[PDB]
Design a protein around this ligand. Structure first.
Ligand SMILES: [K+]
Ligand SMILES: [K+]
Ligand SMILES: [K+]
Ligand SMILES: [K+]
Ligand SMILES: [K+]
Ligand SMILES: [K+]
Ligand SMILES: [K+]
Ligand SMILES: [K+]
Ligand SMILES: [K+]
Ligand SMILES: [K+]
Ligand SMILES: [K+]
Ligand SMILES: [K+]
Ligand SMILES: [K+]
Ligand SMILES: [K+]
Ligand SMILES: [K+]
Ligand SMILES: [K+]
Ligand SMILES: [K+]
Ligand SMILES: [K+]
Ligand SMILES: [K+]
Ligand SMILES: [K+]
Ligand SMILES: [K+]
Ligand SMILES: [K+]
Ligand SMILES: [K+]
Ligand SMILES: [K+]
Ligand SMILES: [K+]
Ligand SMILES: [K+]
Ligand SMILES: [K+]
Ligand SMILES: [K+]
Ligand SMILES: [K+]
Ligand SMILES: [Mg+2]
Ligand SMILES: [Mg+2]
Ligand SMILES: [Mg+2]
Ligand SMILES: [Mg+2]
Ligand SMILES: [Mg+2]
Ligand SMILES: [Mg+2]
Ligand SMILES: [Mg+2]
Ligand SMILES: [Mg+2]
Ligand SMILES: [Mg+2]
Ligand SMILES: [Mg+2]
Ligand SMILES: [Mg+2]
Ligand SMILES: [Mg+2]
Ligand SMILES: [Mg+2]
Ligand SMILES: [Mg+2]
Ligand SMILES: [Mg+2]
Ligand SMILES: [Mg+2]
Ligand SMILES: [Mg+2]
Ligand SMILES: [Mg+2]
Ligand SMILES: [Mg+2]
Ligand SMILES: [Mg+2]
Ligand SMILES: [Mg+2]
Ligand SMILES: [Mg+2]
Ligand SMILES: [Mg+2]
Ligand SMILES: [Mg+2]
Ligand SMILES: [Mg+2]
Ligand SMILES: [Mg+2]
Ligand SMILES: [Mg+2]
Ligand SMILES: [Mg+2]
Ligand SMILES: [Mg+2]
Ligand SMILES: [Mg+2]
Ligand SMILES: [Mg+2]
Ligand SMILES: [Mg+2]
Ligand SMILES: [Mg+2]
Ligand SMILES: [Mg+2]
Ligand SMILES: [Mg+2]
Ligand SMILES: [Mg+2]
Ligand SMILES: [Mg+2]
Ligand SMILES: [Mg+2]
Ligand SMILES: [Mg+2]
Ligand SMILES: [Mg+2]
Ligand SMILES: [Mg+2]
Ligand SMILES: [Mg+2]
Ligand SMILES: [Mg+2]
Lengths: 50, 64, 146
RNA sequence: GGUGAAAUUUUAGUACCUGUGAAGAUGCAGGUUACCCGCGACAGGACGGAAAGACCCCAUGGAGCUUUACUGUAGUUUGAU
RNA sequence: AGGUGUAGUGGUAGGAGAGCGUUCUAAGGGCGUUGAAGGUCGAUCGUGAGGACGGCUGGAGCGCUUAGAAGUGAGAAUGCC
RNA sequence: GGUAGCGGAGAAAUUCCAAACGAACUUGGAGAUAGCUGGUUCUCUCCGAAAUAGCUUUAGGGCUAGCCUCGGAAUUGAGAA
RNA sequence: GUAGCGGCGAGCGAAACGGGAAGAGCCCAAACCAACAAGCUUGUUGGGGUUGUAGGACUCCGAUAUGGUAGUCUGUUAGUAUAGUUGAAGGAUUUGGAAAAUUCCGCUAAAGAGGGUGAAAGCCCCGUAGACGAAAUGCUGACAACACCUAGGAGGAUCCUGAGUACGGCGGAACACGAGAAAUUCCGUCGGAAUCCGCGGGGACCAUCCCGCAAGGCUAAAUACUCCCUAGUGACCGAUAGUGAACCAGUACCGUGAGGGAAAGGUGAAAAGCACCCCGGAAGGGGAGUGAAAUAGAUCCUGAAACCGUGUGCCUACAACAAGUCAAAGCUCGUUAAUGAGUGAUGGCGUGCCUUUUGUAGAAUGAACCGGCGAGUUACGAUUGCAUGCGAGGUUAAGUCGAAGAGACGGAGCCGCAGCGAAAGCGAGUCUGAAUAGGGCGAAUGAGUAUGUAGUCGUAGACCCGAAACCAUGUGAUCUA
């Protein structure tokens, strides 16, 4: 979700992790990942975007 | 750039509902003494652009 | 899908044909142009509609008519399109625009009697064909010129 | 003995006659002649080399020239202002 | 998935179809000082473009699969160096 | 020292103007234009012409038709012998 | 690519409306007033005034406020550019000349961007994320100061509101508009107004109506471009490429001059660049050394081909041969082990490749050979096939936010859903016609649209190379007249 600075900061350096915000999520983002880890509020925001 | 319509053609033909082209007739300007009344009467009627000619000019009227 | 297993839909994408890349391709050497002449030349070819000097078809034919400066063209609506509204609906150029039936009303809405009208409506439009007026009122509706 | 280019050159183990063939073949056919490698000489052939024929024709090519060709125009001259 | 039967399968201009190989991109999966690419040799495989596998050379990078994009294939231009 | 290319100079030859002057040289417009000649690079499979008519400041160019190819629609089967 | 322009040819080609980016408005001249100077006006200065629902002067009253700024090396302040500081975490083992490779267990991460290091390193180095830093000089923003602008309402008697101007004739030009029926704008020439009861425009012209108020000036932003500077990016090049120039290149070299204009990168991890010896005058070699390797020795990585040579398995001195191919003894060899390899006496058959042609071995063309380079591309449009999404609908463009991304918003617009007619116009019809006729085009008898992809076309050099020439600036009379 938007505003979660510290979760984004702590995740991004891991070589197997890709970080996006719920409002900036692209098809290429999703297809690249084997798994999607989404917070509950991120999922709700996505469902509001789509 | 956009393709340009051939302006001279556009002044002479009309796109019909079937996509064909309606055209006027040659030999309808003067020297009517040289032509029978039957010829004049039937040249009074409009015609269509023939198949061979249409393929040659079709690109020139795409956006007419 | 997976980035290592992409597949386009069948027939969606084709391979470009490259000319002048050997004889067995079928477009080697002359690259499909044949032998000599104007059409074999780079940039060669005559302008569209050129008949090699025979008077072109368009020169043979007279210019006809004129364009009216005051010409008015109306957006056509037929009765079958008005069956989409419920009985008693007020059909308006605004209503038709919101319905997406008429995006461009041009000089105005004109109603034509192509199909059969089956609902009662109070129809407002710039013009009415006589048949369309009868159909709308025969359905117990009413027309109004705006 | 020393020094050391060049034009040319599809690859060439590169004969003769008569014939044949895009109608004048070292190279195809038939026959004839001819051991292998050179050196000094000569030019008949390789339609030899050199130059994308200059003659000829063609290209709705070019350039220079001419005139009572066309269309313009510097200059000159005449009038109005 | 294959099988049977009949028929067909010369080809310039040219149309159609289906592929080979080159460099790069992405993802996946891999190979490399226990020797990558490149070079060279071999009696190897496929219907073709072409593909492997060994020895030698070489000393750092490079395949494969799927998809993408192309300065993507040369023997001729009196081509250029 | 003077005369410069829409030019100069010429005891006059189209003569000279930096080793080609019916109009210098250089750079630019500029990749001028070239209905002309030359060149145009991997593979296999299917099919496969034309060198004709008409018109053309047209005749070695072009255009429509004819002949090739690919796709599609459809009929009381309209083709061929 | 519409309206139009156009030997109505080739071609040329708008504008307004609509949607956006950005937005900001102001000063003069004249009337009039005051001062001064001069010859009642006639100049200078200052005031005054600035326009179209007409404004202003002027005459009445009434407030000396309130707001604004496209002012200044006016300071003050903050930020910022131009140096920097700080910045986590690995040791062994196997291979090797060397480890970052490998295996084993660890750890660090707001840092796993990237570069370097004796091979390929998150933890060795430079860095990176992050935190931090300015004596000095710029630049920017505020804040303050100062300066500069900023009056309301009612009256029309009179005065002002840009003249040799507007405009017209003639000749040119600009307007998409080629004189045309040619409005609008401008240039030369000549003629030449009105002025508020006025003047201009609404595409000849007139009337009416509507909209404006020329002949004075200034004005930020949204727009164009990048020689340079800083930080970066690339399904861009990788030395015949990429700039002409990776290298002491606009150099060498050519030319009187303008001007033309090259070639040319790589030892190795480190020079550790071969002490010493030997042949030689030297060059150059042979040893000995260095090195993991010197057949890495500086013409130095790799080291193809043409070409040149040495060795020799087989063949060749009676033979006329595009030189191979098929058949084949003999001899010599032993493989990706395959009904193998090399050579080949002798026999049959057999006139290269390309281009261009009715027809070429051609005594037509092209190639000395080898290597490299060298030709249908891209953009915008048209159109068709294929494909996907949606479907009587389909779709956004510019733009805004956003990683130079996807995406979101944006419906202005575009195509389609109705045609017929030159047009008024009518409309599943319509036009022609007197016609309820006939006939044309349509409907009946519906599929479109966005995007991708391919074929072809159009505008562009448009597949590549090639003229003789044409035009416009320059450079040359050191040759020669
Ligand atoms: K016509
Ligand atoms: K006539
Ligand atoms: K073709
Ligand atoms: K011949
Ligand atoms: K001779
Ligand atoms: K000449
Ligand atoms: K090998
Ligand atoms: K060549
Ligand atoms: K002389
Ligand atoms: K066809
Ligand atoms: K357009
Ligand atoms: K013409
Ligand atoms: K004032
Ligand atoms: K590193
Ligand atoms: K400062
Ligand atoms: K005019
Ligand atoms: K107007
Ligand atoms: K107006
Ligand atoms: K080496
Ligand atoms: K030998
Ligand atoms: K033989
Ligand atoms: K010849
Ligand atoms: K009818
Ligand atoms: K009728
Ligand atoms: K579709
Ligand atoms: K398409
Ligand atoms: K081109
Ligand atoms: K093209
Ligand atoms: K002289
Ligand atoms: Mg007439
Ligand atoms: Mg007659
Ligand atoms: Mg493609
Ligand atoms: Mg062919
Ligand atoms: Mg060829
Ligand atoms: Mg050719
Ligand atoms: Mg021919
Ligand atoms: Mg042809
Ligand atoms: Mg004969
Ligand atoms: Mg003979
Ligand atoms: Mg022979
Ligand atoms: Mg024979
Ligand atoms: Mg000769
Ligand atoms: Mg010749
Ligand atoms: Mg056969
Ligand atoms: Mg490579
Ligand atoms: Mg190429
Ligand atoms: Mg070559
Ligand atoms: Mg003479
Ligand atoms: Mg001379
Ligand atoms: Mg030009
Ligand atoms: Mg056949
Ligand atoms: Mg003619
Ligand atoms: Mg550190
Ligand atoms: Mg490790
Ligand atoms: Mg004009
Ligand atoms: Mg006027
Ligand atoms: Mg005038
Ligand atoms: Mg008004
Ligand atoms: Mg500006
Ligand atoms: Mg270079
Ligand atoms: Mg190289
Ligand atoms: Mg160069
Ligand atoms: Mg070696
Ligand atoms: Mg070497
Ligand atoms: Mg004998
Ligand atoms: Mg013998
Ligand atoms: Mg001949
Ligand atoms: Mg030959
Ligand atoms: Mg010969
Ligand atoms: Mg030759
Ligand atoms: Mg001079
Ligand atoms: Mg002199």
């Amino acid at each position: 979700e938007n505003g979660n600075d510290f979760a984004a900061l702590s995740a991004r350096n891991l070589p197997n992790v890709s970080v996006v915000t719920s409002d900036n999520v692209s098809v290429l983002d999703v297809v690249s990942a084997n798994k999607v880890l989404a917070t509950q509020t991120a999922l709700t925001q996505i469902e509001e975007v789509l | 750039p956009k393709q340009k319509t051939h302006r001279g053609l556009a002044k002479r033909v009309k796109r019909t509902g079937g996509g064909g082209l309606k055209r006027g007739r040659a030999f309808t300007s003067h020297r009517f003494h040289g032509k029978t009344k039957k010829q004049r009467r039937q040249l009074r009627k409009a015609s269509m652009v023939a198949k061979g000619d249409y393929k040659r000019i079709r690109q020139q009227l795409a956006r007419m | 899908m997976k980035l290592h297993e992409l597949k386009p839909a069948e027939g969606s994408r084709q391979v470009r044909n490259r000319v002048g890349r050997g004889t067995s391709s079928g477009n080697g050497k002359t690259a499909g142009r044949g032998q000599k002449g104007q059409k074999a030349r780079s940039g060669g070819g005559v302008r569209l509609g050129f008949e090699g000097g025979q008077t072109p078809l368009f020169r043979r034919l007279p210019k006809r008519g004129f364009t009216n400066i005051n010409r008015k063209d109306y957006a056509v609506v037929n009765l079958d399109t008005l069956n989409r509204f419920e009985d008693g609906t007020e059909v308006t150029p605004v209503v038709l625009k919101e319905a997406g039936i008429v995006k461009n009303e041009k000089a105005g809405i004109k109603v034509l009697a192509d199909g059969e009208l089956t609902k009662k409506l109070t129809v407002k439009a710039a013009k009415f064909s006589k048949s369309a007026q009868e159909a709308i009122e025969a359905a117990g509706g009413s027309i109004e010129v705006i």
